[PDB]
Every structure is written in C-alpha cells, then in structure tokens.
C-alpha cells in the first residue's frame, strides 16, 4: 500500500487523472489556504509541473505522487476529514451569518482621544478565523491594519512567562481580577498591580522583558516573537499612533511614578524609558487575518498552526488564557466570563482577540466602542457565536441541548 | 453478526464458557461497580441463574446472552474501552498516590465554631471519583457522612436556575466575584449580593426555590432533587448540626435583616423562615461517595452518570460551573482558579466538591481547614491532580508538555 | 451701702416708688422669664404683697427690699447688663428677621417612613433661644411636641461618659467621623463603630448606660436626667412613634446582629432588649422651648442655666460638643463644620439642636428634610445666623470684619 | 490728669526718678520684648537719651514722658494687665514645666528619606509662644532654622483664599477630611482633592497663587507674604532641602500627573512647574520664634500681633483654622481634634505650628517623629498643655473644673 496512492483514488473518483483545479478546489474546501507554509513544497512542485508540461493540465497516479509526497501527512488529514472542524464549508457559512447579524449593531463611539483612531471609520467590521489546524476564513474588512493597543497585553505576558517562568513574573504582578469598583486602584493589597491585563500590570510586565538591552532591541525581540505567533503574516508598527500615545498619556505617567515610589519595578529599571517601550508595544499593527493566527497559537497549546513552529511554552499559554478569562474585557470581564466563557481581550482601536481553546482563534474588529470600552459589534458577535456553538468553557461536549457542535459531523 | 455474541468471545478468550466470577472481575476492572443502577437488569438475571444450577457456575453463549442483552450497549462500551478514561485501573493507582501524598499534610484546624464539627477527627480523609461514564473509585474514609455546609450552595443555585431560568434568578443575585477585600460587603452596587457562592447570595437563592409551599415541602423538594443528582446514593440530614447553626448564626441573621431592609427578597418572603430553611440546607448530609456522583452530574451536562436521568438543564449546569470557577473557594478563589482551573466548591466541614467537565466529578473530605477556610488535604490534592493531568481548564488537549492524559491509551 | 438699695435707684428713675408693672417690664427685657426658677422667691413675694396691699400697685425702698432680697444677685447681674448678651431686645429682633428669612424656604420632603412623622405639616417652623444665663426668646411653633430621634444621640453619649468616663466608653465606640463614602459601614477598622453620632455607635452607647438593671429603670434613669438638663420643662414620650419605629427597623436589627457577632457590646448584653431601649430613646418628645434649655446646658459647661443645677461633668460636655462638631449632621457634617462651625445635631423629625459654646443653645424645627436628612429651614437658619454673628468656632472675638457681636454693646 | 503721667507713677512707686534698667525689667515682665516693632520710637528715644546724660541713667516725669508718649496706649495696656494673659510671668513658668516634661520623651525616628532631615539631632527641642498682644517666651532650641514642609500648607491656603476668596479656591479643592483609611486616594468623588492639608490638595492650591506670573516672582510674592505674617522675624530657604525634595519626590509627580489627567488645575497651568514651586515652598525655613508669630497672626483674626498690620482677611483665617482643626495631623487628625481641640499643623522636619484662637500662637520643634508622622515631644506637649489650661476648643470659659485659665487673675 501507499499513502500518496490511496489519497489519489479518493480524489480521482474512480477516474484516470486529476485536473489541477479539481485538486486545488478539493484542498481549499478543507479550509487550507493554498499559500500555507506547511504546503510550500507541494505547491512549488505543482507550479513546476504546470510549466514542464503545458501538455496538461492532468496528473496521473505517479505525477500526483511527485508533488504530494513532501506534505502527505498534512494533506491526508485534510482530505480524510481529520481536522478539528471537519465540515469547514458549513461552519464558515455560519460565521458569515453571525457576521451579518453583528453588522447591524451600529451603536458605539469610536475612540477619539487621539486623532489616529478618530481617523478610522465606524463602518469597518471584520472577523478572521484560524483553527488549531490552519483552516482559514475571513469576512469583511480583514486586511485593514489597526493597532493592537490593549490586545497586546496578553501577548506580552506570554512572552514574559515564556522567558522567565510563572514564579518570577508573579513577584511583580498579581493573578486575580480586582473587583467592579476597584478599577481605579493601581495596586492590590500586596503592593503589586492586580494582574497583567490592567494598565498598571501591563507596564510592570513590560519592565521584565529582555532587561539589560536598550529599547530598540527589546522592540525587535518582541516583534520577532509576534511574527512567529502569526506564521509570518502582517505584523507592523504605527509611528503616528505612537507619537500621539506619547503626548497624551498623562494617566500612564501617573502610574509609572506611583509604581516607582512603591518599588514595583525590577531593580535598575528606567521607569520613563519603560513608558516609551510600553507606548511602542501598544502601537504595533495587525490585520484581522494576522491576529487570528496569533490567537490560534494560544488556542493550539503554543504551536503556530500554520507553521508547526513552537512559539510559547505550555505554561505561558495556560497562564495567559487563565487571565484573559477573568480580567480580559475591562469592567465587562465578569459578565463576559459568565455569558461567553471564552478567553478574550479587547482594545481601544476596536479589536477583540478571541480564543476557543483546542478549536480556533479569532480577531474581530470594529472601531466604535460601547461605554465600557469594547467594540460594539465584537461583543455582539461573541455572544452570538456562543449561543450557536457549544464553545463556552462550561458547555458540555456530549449533552449540549440545541447548540450545534462543529467538531462533529452527523 | 451479533453484539451479545461478539462480547461473549471478547471475554471468553476462545475458551468454552465464562465462569461467573471471571465476568464480575472483568466488569469491576472497567471501573463500573457491580451495583450500578444501569446494570440492575443484568445483575438480576445473574442473581437468578446463580440459583438455577449450582452445577456451574459457567455461562454458555446462550446463558451469558440471557443476562447481558438487556444492558448490552453499556457493557460493550465498557469492554471495548470507549469510556472517558479507557484504562481506569491505572488511573485509580494514580489517585491512590495523590491521596497518600495528601494524607501527610496534617496541618490545619478543624472548624470548632459548632460542637458538631469539633467532634470530627483530624485523621479523616476520603476521596471519591465518578466519571461521566459511571466508573467509580474510592480511597480513605469515603462512607462517613458529613454536612455539605457551603458545598450545597452551587447545588441549590442549580435547582433555582433549573426551575426559574437565568434571567429571573439573576434579578436577585449577581454573577461576578466581589474582590479580594470586598468579602465583608453583602451587596454589590446594584443592591444584589455579589454571586450565589457567598452567604448573602446563598440566602437570597434559598428564597427562590419552590415559593408558595411551606418550609417542610421546600426541604422535601430539595431532597428529592439531591437524590436524583446522586443516583440515589446517600443523602441525609443532621438535626444536631442544624440546631447549632440555628443557635449560633448571628451573622446570618445580620445578613438576612440587611437584605430585608434593602428589599432583596421576592415579595411575600418570610425572611426569618428562609434563614431556618437555609440553616437546614447547610446541614444536609452526604458521604464522599454519594457527593462524587453529584459532582459527576454537573460534569456530565446535567445527566446523572449512574442512572442516565436528566436532572438539570444545560443552562443551570453551565451557569453553576461558571460561578464555581471564580467564586468557589472563598478568598482562595482567585489563586485557585489560576493554578487549578477547575470549578470547585468548598465547605467548613472540610468538603471540596470538584468537577472536571466532560471527564469526572470528585469529592474530597478532610475536616482540618486552612486559614482561608478550605480543607488542607483537599487543596493539596487539587494542586497535585492538576500538576499530574492535563485537566486544567486551559491546558491544551494536544500539546500538554510532560503531564499525563487519562483520556488516551 | 446696700445692693437692694442701689438696684432700687437704678429702676427708681429718681422717683419715690416703683410701679410693679414697671419693674416686671424692666425684668422681662433682660430676657429673663418671669417664671424662671432662680426667681421664684421674688415672684412669690411680689404676688403676696399684691394681695396684702391692694392699695397699690406701688413699691417703696423697703417693700422692694422685701421681695428682691432672696434673688438679688441674679437680679443685679440682669439689670447691670452683666448677662452674656447685654442687649437682648435688639438680638431677638435679629432672631426674628433670621426666622422670617427662612420661613420663605419651603422646599424639602417630610419624613414619611412611619405614619407619625408624615402627619406633621410642612409649614411648621420654630426656633427657641436660651443663653447660658437663662435669657429666653421664641418665634413660631415653639410649643409643638416632636420626637428627638437622632437628636438624642449626643445626650445619651453625654450620659454614658458622665457616668463612666471617656476611656471606658471609647473602648466600645470611636471618636472620628468616617469619610463621606464610609457611610454604609457599621464598624471602623478596630471593630468599634466609628463614633457615637452614627446609628451603629448610638446603639452601642445605649448598651453602656445603666448596665445590670432592666429597661424600665434605664428609661427612668435617662428621663430624670433629661429633666434636669431641660430645667424641668417639657420632656415627653411618644408611644405611637416607638411602636412604628420598632416594627419598621430592619436596618437597626441588622446593626444589632452584626454588632453581636463582632462582640461590640459588653459581656452580658441582651442585644434585642438594647434595641428596644434604643427605639424608646428615639421617641422621647420635646418642644422647641424645652429642647433649647438642653442645648444651653451643653453650652454652659454642664450647668442648666435656668436652675443653676450641675447636670453633666465638664468632661462629658466637652466630648459631646467635639463629636457634634464633626459627626452631627450626617453626610453634611464636613460642609456644616466648615461653613457654620458649631456643635449641632440633626434628627429625622426636623429638629436641629444647636450649641454656641459660652453663649447659648438653640433648637430649630421644621419637618421637611433635604436629601441628606436635615431640616431645610433649620440649615438655612444656621447659615444665616453665623453670617450675621461672630459665633463660628474660629471667628475672631476681636477682628470679626462686618459681623455683629451680641456679646458687646457699642 | 495725663496718660503718660499716670503711667509714670504706676512704675515710679512714689519715688523721685525711674532708673532705666528698672523700666526695662518692668516692661519685659509684661512679656513684651524690648525689640517689639510697636515700641521702636520708645526704644529709639531711650537709646537717644542714654547718650546725652551719662550722668544718669534716670528719667524725670518729663523725660520718661519724652520717650513713652509715642507708644503710650500699648505701654499702658501692658502695665495695667490688660493683656490677654495678665500674669505672663506665671504662665511661662508653666510652659517651662511642660517643656521639661516632654524633653523626657525621647522616642521616635528622625525623618530619613532625605539627607537634610537625617542631619538634625534627635535631641533638639524648642517651644515658642506669641500671644494676640505680642507677649513672647521661648524655651529650648528656638533660634535653630528648620524647614516647614507640610506646615506651609495652611499658610499658602490662607494666601490663596485671601487673594481670591473661598468660592473660587474651593472649586479646585474640597473642605472635609477624607476618612481614616481613605488616605491613599488623591481625589474625592467630585474629582477635587479632599482638602488643602493633603499632598494632592496642597499641590492644587499651589497652582492658584498668583497665576500668570513666573516661578521666581510667585516665590517672591509668597516670601513677602510670609514676612508680613512673622513681623519680619526669621524667614529663610534651604537650597539643599529643595534639591533633595525634587530628586526623590516620585509620589509627588505621581500626584501631579494624576491631577493633570483629571483636569484638576485651572486653565493654562504648567503642571511640572507647579511641582517645582511646591517643592520650593516646602523648603522655606523658620525658627521656633519666627514661626510662632505666624501662628499668632492666625490666632489674631489676620492682624500680626507684633506689627499691627492686617495680613490676611478674616475669611481666610477662619477657613484655615477650620481645615487645620480636622486635617492637620495626618492619620492623627481625628484623635488630635478630639483630645487637644486646637487647630494645628504638623510637618516632617518635626514642627507643629499650633493656634489657640484669641489667646496665642505656638511653634514646637523636635525632629523625632511618630509612626503617624508627628513630632513626639511636640505631640506630648500639646496634650499636656490642654490638660492644664481650658484652651480646648469646647472647654467652657466659665465652668472648667480644675484646669487653670491664663486669661484671669
Ligand atoms: C477618584 C476617586 O474617587 N478615588 C480615587 N481613585 N483612584 C485614585 O488614584 C489613585 C488611587 C490611590 N493609589 C492607589 N492604588 N492602589 C492602592 N491600594 C493599596 C493597598 O496600595 S492606592 C493610586 C491611584 S483616587
Ligand atoms: C471592614 C470594616 O471596616 N467595616 C465593615 N465591614 N463589614 C461591614 O458589614 C456591613 C458593611 C455595610 N453594609 C454593606 N454591605 N454591602 C454594601 N455595598 C454597597 C455598595 O453599599 S454596604 C452591611 C454589611 S462594616
């Protein structure tokens, strides 16, 4: 027997040779993107034989064997329905409906405190999915760059725990939510910030990453890291947003000094310098698509799903998801944890980084925020998604009532 | 082909006939207990034929099929290792290691606030498991009855949400935790108690269950409900514990009166009676074993695993596990949710009712409490369990480092 | 020489005999009331000679000497303008103006949570003055009985420290105000109520007065005490108010149980009985006139000014004035101390018991309360009073700008 | 008859001529200092006459009248015991006892966070009095200059209310104390600092004084203002303290940035400059003697008692005495108001500027502080002072038990 050969008969349909487009659309219908890095050898060989023989465009058992041999393990799982969402075409149909249902929630106010997010239109709205297996789907304004802002706080924490361990990082920052009107305090009772998703704890976590090196190499260190998470999709940097964040951050300058007085930073910290590195990290740019790969990396126990690369330790990813559950959505965290039950993180540009552990990661984006600071459409989408699918943290995988389960088939 | 016949050769091992004891030990090793209610029919036919011919005790293809046809699907799943933990024999060996490792933590102080918990010895310690499929195992003092106390709070919240729905119950109680030094407040800013796991909200939740009937019928209704949840295993009641909570509950009278003044109960409430009903509910008795079935009922989306009965709506169970995750372990809730990541609920008699969703439910019991109020051995066990198995809520099921996974082979 | 003889020529106005009405009007104009207990002998002797010599009504040097001998010291000080307010006639004209200026502030809501405080008309308004010397003046509805309610807290605190001393009493109750959003807390951080003017602390103090005896003698012990303080003017008791306060006091029962749990009472306290005794003390009745004598006794270092009787130790009065200054007007305490600067206490019936140390006591009464719980007209009257006179605690007795000083003349 | 003549016989004692020393000693025993500014003409004429007739040194009815006519009303009041404390010689004997009783309380820790307050000896200790009439007395280290630090907060609040009025100033700062552990907060619920005695509110008040002018002239205005208040006694500036206060005042920058974000300042303020101006004001230097005259100006309705000039409006003095009563001694404020009953203000150098309204002002100084931040010897002295004299705010001026009253004979 032979794996390349048995896969050949599945797509051959008893016939003699497979047209290339018939193989291409069969492969794309699994949700894989024809530009998947795990598929580069297969696609390079296909492009070559489509030159070598204008005499086509048909592959026999032996010619198909030449192309798919290099990536046969991933292609077989994709064609024999072994992916975490087996019927991806029906699932994306559902994502499209949920998107259109949220597209009608036109309330909210765009963050206006800086001219660079006031520039963004309230009609933008996109959602990108990326499963723990690499299946992609987008709808809407998903290639528009926008800043992570507070969406970057869980990614920084993951990098800090990945490099320093849990016990070290949690000398300097706590692990609990604060309480629905302890939002205005910087420190909990141990004179540590309450947790990494809070501004005071985000700043302290920022002062742990790559100490001893200067602000240019730290920024390089974190961006190289964010590239691995996104399978080398778009990660950028807005100097416009950063220069404004620098000139309008009196609240954070207040935090920095209060943290200096109470000896919250590591010894030898340049507090004002850490504030620049902090403002920088909030001005990193993503699209919906590139961020949906980041979120899926946390969804996937730390391995980027479109490269197979190990990016974060299981200890760093578990801690980040734990803190996104309960501290992730500003004052909505408690209500969100109850009704949605997913690790999520919101931002002022309109991002919501959403992780369905063991299934997929997502990024929703609509600039207009409601009064607690979360994208109006994004929050609507997240409620709708969990009403439809048994992805809630404490839904049952066996007795889930009237919800659909995309991890099953019939 | 034939499903009863194929199982016969599976356990017969090509041989002539199955001894009766060889079938029972084969069955017990799947984790099923020979008294499972879903197996009563099979066990009745065995009880009949073990009289029919003392010239035995051997079952032919036809005689084995005589007993097992009634329960063949459940027996096939158990023998083709389709149960949520396929190698149950090995997993219980690990539970024994974790139990013995916690048995050496003799620190802590027994709750003495009532003479009925001061009389319980610091040497007691039991652990019971019940998987979403019915596989059972116990170690230690697992049949000694004890009161739930605050372990009962998630169970009554489930009943209330099961009968009245989420929107109603949460007109009267919040959904968030309060904050690590907001423990001393009764109400949040919307004038509802913070959540059903704290005393002020447990008191309010109690005033919602089965309104319009008197306190004796209310209590009977909750006992009937707690019976369905434990697959009819041990549920009792201590009149002694009830009398001491009654005569020493000035704090609960303080809460009750504060809630009456700020109009937190549903209209037509006899506040003083509801405290009596509340004190009663805290004095319900369980054993480790019976409660581990209750926990598995939450683990199993609302269906009791040793009877298959639908006991709670999926909405009541999802809400209860949500609120146990973040509010279940007193001031330890935050540290606990981070490190263990399992919905749990603790009590002052020393209980910790523990849920691993889609896998199993658990009950630990050791009377000596730490300074935050949680059983010392019980907390030690929960850390060790999650350190060993990828049961943490935000462990990944595919890339889980050097932890063991009891769901695979 | 002779005091009876020189006071004789003071009123004689060079003629030979004094009409009786001419002496009485001279006496009333000092503000003394012709029924002052320190004047009983003089008034009895005057009424007697108006029977024995109907051939009058005129008194010579020797007949004047017959009547005023007994109370000549009090009469001389009154006639030689030696009283704390020498020109009482002019001062009462001002009290009348201040009264009329507040009669025009008809806002507020009468307290309605029990039927007997809702029954009071919103148009009642009275104010009574009583100096440390006994000079009286009233305007408005000054003889209508009403309940003290929270006005009783400074009087029972004074009774407790008069019998037990400060250090004993302040084992069970603090001495500071709480902070404008520590209002809902019962205990401070030492597990004592914050101070005697708050409900939780008034209840605890009630549990220190006259321990070991039952509720009837306790009530008698306190009423006799209030009688001495008011120079035997009207002190009464509403059983109606007590019955409604009792069956509608769920927060006070809430306080009682919380205080039992945290062991705030003395050993052997019958907590529910102390709540009965507390409700009773809140339903004791006064009129404006009778309550204004109470206030002056605190103004007067503990000596009731119309009987000369020592009623409270100087330690008890100093402490009670200290706490009325900072805790007496509910959430208005800080604003009141700042702008009025007088020891004062308010109640839900509409009373404000007011003390100007070393000068006078006062009681204002108008049932309509403002949104913090204080009589609207009463608070208005207090601001007006101190804008007019240098009575504010930290006004200067020498350089007081354009304010009037009733303690001086020209 | 004649005012200069009757005064002459008062001190002449029927004799022929008054020696010069006999008059100077008579004058000092009234407590006036032979250098009072209100006595300059009289002392100039004495210094003028002490040269012409070295064949003296004794004054006739006419030569005494030569000098004293210019200041006759002040001298007569002092000699017919019309001063607020008629028997000053006996009163200072009592302050000497109180000083000596506190000198035996050697506990406390000198402020260490800057090298300029660690340099001061733990055994320095001074007390100075100055009455509303100008009678002076000191015991101890009363001419050693030290920084006001937070003692300057009431003086600048007074300047601000004196120049702009109460309604304007209290748009930017509240008027209550905060709550015994609401100390860690900067703003109340109205987004104003709680009151001027607090760091967050002193910072805001600093931003209202003389707006629109630069930091050098602003500082000159405040020094000119402090000079009128101390009757031109010693006021200085420590540049060392100012350099260390700015280079270690991270909490103050935290306050400034938080106050800037919540728009607490008036329009057009350079927040970073106002922190410099604030640090400067905290480094103003005084001695015990000079600062107690400042206190006497507050005691005296705004008129400096040793020059007679009006320095502050009565509205400003009342408000500052109001806020010093309740906020002046950090976490000790409530306790202090209850037990001492005097408006006072403390500072980290160890000063306590204390006001007994309508009688006298005071300044105590001993560097070793409490754990709440107040001078130990200074706090002890204030308690002792009020146990002795009926100066407590709510003492009775008529029925005051066994306490002494320095205002009577
Ligand atoms: C606006 C209002 O009404 N109140 C206020 N809210 N926030 C304010 O800003 C500061 C609060 C004080 N600081 C603290 N952080 N954590 C603390 N707890 C401990 C145990 O250290 S204290 C820094 C921020 S003031
Ligand atoms: C720790 C300390 O110093 N004092 C105290 N600690 N606990 C106390 O119990 C009482 C607190 C006051 N009441 C309230 N409950 N919830 C509330 N929430 C809101 C938003 O109003 S207010 C009744 C219980 S007092």
Write the DSSP string, D70-127: TTHHHHHHHHTT-SSSS-HHHHHHHHHHHHHHHTT---SB---SSHHHHTS-TT--EE
Task: Supply D351's token pair.
Answer: 């000063």
Beta bridge partners of A389: A404
Token pair 């004789």: residue: C8
β-bridge mates for residue C116, sequence order: none
DSSP letter (8 states) at residue C313: -
Question: How do beta strands D284-286 and D235-237 pair?
Answer: antiparallel
Backbone angles phi, psi at A355, to 5 degrees: -125, 125
How far away, in angstroms, is C183 Cα from ligand 2 center? 9
Closest by Cβ to C337, choosing from D178, D326, D338:
D326
C393 and C303 within one domain: yes
Ligand having the closest approach to the CA of D187:
1
E strand or H helix at B364: strand B360-365
Closest of D158, D309, D154, D142 to residue D230, by C-alpha: D309
Paired with A338 in beta bridges are: none
DSSP-derived secondary structure letter, D237:
E
Determine if residue B289 is labeled as part of a ligand binding site.
no
Is the CB of A179 less than 8 angstroms away from the CB of B175?
no
Are residue B48 and residue B193 in the same domain, yes or no?
no
| Cis? peptide before C120, omega within 30° of 0 | no
* Gap between the Cα atoms of B140 and B163, Å rounded: 36
A56 and A130 housed in the same domain: no
| Atom 24 of ligand 2, residue of closest alpha carbon | B185
Overall size of chain D counted in residues: 409
Phi, then psi, of C147 in degrees rounded to 5: -85, 145
Q: Which chains border C (3 or more CB–CB pairs < 8 Å)?
A: B, D
- The 3-state DSSP class for residue A354 equals strand
Q: Which residues contact C337 (CB under 8 A, 6 or more apart)?
A: C325, C326, C393, D322, D325, D326
Q: Tell the residue nearest (CA) to atom 12 of ligand 1.
A: D185
Tokens for B332?
A: 């330890």
Instruction: Please compute Rg for chain D using Cα positions.
Output: 23
Q: Count other Cβ atoms within 10 Å, centred on residue B16.
A: 8
Chain C CB contacts of B261 under 8 Å are: 250-251, 254
Cis ω before B328 (30° cut-off from 0) = no
Contacts of A113 in chain D (CB under 8 A): none
Question: What is the arrangement of strands in the sheet containing B235-237, beginning at the earlier edge strand?
Answer: B146-147, B284-286, B235-237
A358 is in an annotated binding site: no
Measure the CA–CA gap between B330 and B328, rounded to whole angstroms.
Answer: 6
Contact A152, A225 (CB under 8 A): no
- Is the same domain home to A333 and A284? yes
Q: Is B187 in the pocket of ligand 2 (CB under 6 A)?
A: yes
- Phi, then psi, of A2 in degrees rounded to 5: -170, 130
Cited resolution, angstroms:
3.0
Chain C hits for B260, Cβ within 8 Å: 250, 254
- Which A residues 219-258 touch D at CB under 8 Å? 250-251, 253-255, 257-258
Residue written as tokens 């407790």? C160
D323 contact residues in C (CB cutoff 8 A): 338
- What's the CA angle centered on B382, arms B379 and B383, to 5 degrees? 90
CA distance B57 to B51: 10
Structure tokens at D210: 């003389």
Q: Bridge partners of C235?
A: C286
Peptide bond preceding A57: is omega within 30 degrees of 0, i.e. cis?
yes
D113 lines ligand 1 (CB under 6 A): no
List C187's β-bridge partners, or say none: C193
Please state, in angstroms and rounded to a whole number, the distance separating the CA atoms of residues B204 and A300: 41
CB C71 within 8 A of CB C38: yes
A96 lies in the same domain as A43 = no
**Is the Cβ of D339 closer than 8 Å to some Cβ of chain A?**
no
CA A277 to CA A284: how far, in whole Å? Answer: 11
| Co-location of C178 and C301 in the same domain | yes
Two structure tokens written together for C219: 């009530």
Q: Which secondary structure element, helix H or strand E, spans residue A115, and what is its range? A: helix A115-118
Same domain? D237 vs D289: yes
Distance from CA of D314 to the nearest CA of C (A): 6
Tell me the CA distances in angstroms from B86 to A370, B74, B91, D349, one per residue in order: 48, 14, 9, 74
Strands A58-59 and B344-346: unpaired
Q: Is the dihedral of CA D158, D159, D162, D167 positive or negative?
A: negative
Ligand nearest to the CA of D192: 1
Structural contact between residues D266 and D292, judged by C-beta atoms closer than 8 angstroms: no
Residue B189 and residue B64 share a domain: no
Q: C335 vs D400: CB contact, 8 Å cut-off?
A: no
Structural tokens at position A229: 């998470």
> What DSSP string describes B256-310?
HHHHHHTT-SPTT--HHHHHHHHHHHHTEEE-HHHHHHHHHHHHTTTB-TTT--B
Rounded CA-CA distance C74/C65 in Å is 14
Distance (Å, rounded) from C-alpha C144 to C-alpha C142? 6
Contact D264, D172 (CB under 8 A): yes
For D242-247, the CB contacts below 8 A with 24+ separation are D242/D279, D242/D280, D242/D282, D242/D283, D244/D114, D244/D115, D244/D116, D245/D114, D245/D279, D245/D282, D245/D283, D246/D275, D246/D276, D246/D279
SS3 assignment, position A28: helix
- Tell me, what DSSP letter sits at residue D369? B
| Same-domain status, A247 and A228 | yes
C-beta of C184 in contact with ligand 2 (< 6 A): yes
C263 and C225 together in one domain:
yes
Cα D162 to Cα A245, C335, D159, D216, D230, distances in angstroms: 40, 20, 5, 20, 17
Spatial separation of the C-alpha atoms in residues D214 and A220, rounded to whole Å: 44
- Asked if residue A187 and residue A266 are part of one domain, the reply reads yes
**Distance (Å, whole) CA C363 – CA C154:** 14
**Cβ atoms within 10 Å, residue B283:** 25
Look at chain A and report how many structural domains it folds into. Answer: 2
CB C238 within 8 A of CB C285: yes
Residue B211 burial class via C-beta count within 10 angstroms: exposed 0-12, middle 13-18, buried 19 and up: exposed
Cis peptide bond prior to A128, omega within 30° of 0: no
Helix A215-229 with A271-281: angle, nearest 10 deg: 30
Residues B188, D19: Cα–Cα separation, whole Å: 82
Q: Which of D20, D53, D81 corresponds to the end of one domain?
A: D81
B359 Cβ below 6 A of ligand 2: no
- CB count within 10 Å of CB B75 equals 26
User: What are phi and psi for residue C238, nearest 5 degrees?
Assistant: -100, 110
Q: Residues A347, A368: contact at Cβ < 8 Å?
A: no
HSE at residue A365, side-chain half, CA atoms within 13 A, is 33
Asked whether the beta carbons of C369 and C124 are under 8 A apart, the reply is no
D59 touches D104 (CB < 8 A): no
* Ligand 2 lined by B251 (C-beta under 6 Å): no
Pick from A61, A81, A101: which residue ends a domain? Answer: A81
Q: How far is CA B132 from CA A1, B33, B226, B293, B394, in A?
A: 40, 14, 17, 9, 20
Do C66 and C163 lie in one domain? The reply is no
Spatial distance between the Cα atoms of B11 and B34, rounded to a whole number of angstroms: 17
Chain centroid to Cα B10, Å, comes to: 34
The answer to whether residues C281 and C220 touch, using CB atoms and an 8 Å cutoff, is no
What's the rounded Cα separation, in Å, for the pair D59 and D49?
A: 9
For residue B348, say whether it is annotated as part of any ligand binding site: yes
Task: Ligand 1, residue D186: give the atom nearest the CA.
Answer: 25
Burial of B161 (0-12, 13-18, 19+ CB in 10 A): buried
CB-based contacts of C49-55 (< 8 A; 24+ apart in sequence): C50/C20
Q: From which experimental method does this structure derive?
A: X-ray
The per-residue DSSP string of D314-352 comes to HHHHHHHHHHHHHHTTGGGHHHHHHHT-S-EEE-TTSEE
Among C31, C59, C81, the domain-final residue is: C81
Judged by a CB distance cut-off of 8 A, whether residue B182 touches chain C is: no
Q: Is D217 exposed, middle or buried (0-12, 13-18, 19+ CB in 10 A)?
A: exposed
- Taking the C-alpha atoms of residue D241 and residue B41, their distance in angstroms, rounded to an integer, is 92
Please name the residue whose Cα sits nearest to atom 7 of ligand 2: B184
A69 alpha-carbon distance from chain centroid = 31
Is the CB of D186 inside a 6 Å radius of any atom of ligand 1? yes
Output the CA D261–ligand 1 centroid distance in Å.
14
Token pair for C279? 């409700």
Query: Given 3-state DSSP classes, what are the helix, strand and coil percentages for chain A, each rounded to the nearest 5?
Result: 50, 10, 40
The Cα of A65 is separated from the nearest Cα of chain B by a number of Å equal to 30
- Domain containing B380 equals 82-409
d(CA B282, CA A270): 55
**A348 labelled binding-site residue:** yes
Interface mutation vs chain C, best among D84, D338, D343, D357, most C CBs within 10 Å:
D338
D395 with C314: Cβ contact below 8 A = yes
Phi and psi dihedrals of B38, rounded to 5? -75, -5
Q: How many CB atoms lie within 10 A of CB B212?
A: 7
| Closest residue by Cα to residue D234 from D278, D192, D275, D292 | D292
Q: Are D390 and D396 in contact (CB under 8 A)?
A: yes
Please check whether residue A204 is in contact with residue A172, taking contact to mean a CB–CB distance below 8 angstroms.
Answer: yes
For the beta carbon of residue C199, count every other beta carbon within 10 angstroms.
17
- Rounded Cα distance between A80 and A7, Å, is 8
Question: CA D184 to CA B183: how far, in whole Å?
Answer: 20
The token pair that represents B39 in the structure block: 């197996």
CA-CA distance, B220 to D43, in Å (whole number)?
102
The distance of C84 to chain D (nearest Cα, Å) reads: 11
* Residue D400 contacts C, CB cutoff 8 Å: yes
Q: Which of helix, strand or coil describes residue A326?
A: helix
Q: Is C144 exposed, middle or buried (0-12, 13-18, 19+ CB in 10 A)?
A: middle
For residue B320, the distance in angstroms to the closest alpha carbon of chain A comes to 9
Query: Quick check: B180 contacting A, CB < 8 Å?
Result: yes
């Amino acid at each position: 027997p032979s794996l390349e050969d048995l896969l050949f008969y599945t797509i051959a349909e008893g016939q003699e040779k497979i047209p290339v487009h018939k193989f291409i659309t069969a492969l794309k219908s699994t949700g894989l993107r024809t530009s998947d890095p795990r598929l580069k050898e297969c696609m390079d060989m296909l492009r070559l034989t489509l030159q070598t023989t204008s005499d086509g465009v048909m592959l026999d058992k032996d010619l198909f064997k030449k192309c798919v041999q290099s990536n046969i393990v991933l292609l077989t799982q994709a064609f024999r329905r072994k992916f975490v969402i087996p019927d991806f075409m029906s699932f994306t149909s559902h994502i499209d409906e949920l998107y259109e249902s949220a597209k009608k929630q036109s309330g909210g106010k765009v963050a206006d405190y800086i001219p660079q997010l006031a520039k963004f239109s309230p009609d933008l709205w996109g959602v990108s999915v990326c499963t723990a297996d690499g299946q992609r789907h987008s709808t809407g304004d998903t290639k528009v760059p926008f800043c992570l802002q507070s969406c970057v706080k869980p990614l920084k924490y993951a990098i800090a725990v990945n490099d320093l361990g849990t016990e070290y990082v949690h000398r300097y920052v706590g692990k609990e939510p604060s309480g629905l009107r302890f939002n205005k305090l910087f420190l909990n009772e141990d004179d540590k910030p309450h947790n990494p998703m809070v501004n005071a704890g985000a700043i302290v976590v920022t002062s742990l990453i790559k100490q001893g090196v200067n602000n240019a190499e730290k920024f390089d260190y974190v961006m190289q890291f964010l590239n691995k998470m996104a399978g080398n999709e778009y990660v950028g940097f807005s100097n416009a947003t950063f220069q404004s964040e620098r000139e309008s951050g009196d609240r954070n300058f207040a935090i920095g000094y209060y943290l200096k007085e109470k000896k919250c930073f590591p010894e030898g910290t340049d507090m004002v310098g850490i504030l620049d590195f902090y403002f920088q990290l909030c001005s990193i740019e993503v699209t919906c698509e590139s961020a949906s790969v980041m979120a899926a990396t946390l969804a996937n126990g730390g391995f980027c799903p479109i490269t197979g690369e190990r990016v974060l330790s299981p200890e760093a990813v578990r801690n980040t998801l734990s803190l996104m559950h309960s501290c992730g959505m500003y004052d909505f965290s408690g209500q969100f944890a109850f009704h949605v039950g997913l690790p999520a993180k919101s931002g002022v540009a309109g991002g919501i980084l959403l992780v369905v552990p063991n299934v997929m990661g997502m990024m929703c984006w609509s600039p207009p925020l409601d009064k607690m600071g979360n994208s109006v459409k994004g929050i609507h989408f997240c409620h709708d998604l969990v009403s439809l699918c048994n992805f809630h943290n404490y839904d049952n995988l066996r007795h889930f009532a009237k919800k659909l389960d995309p991890r099953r088939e019939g």
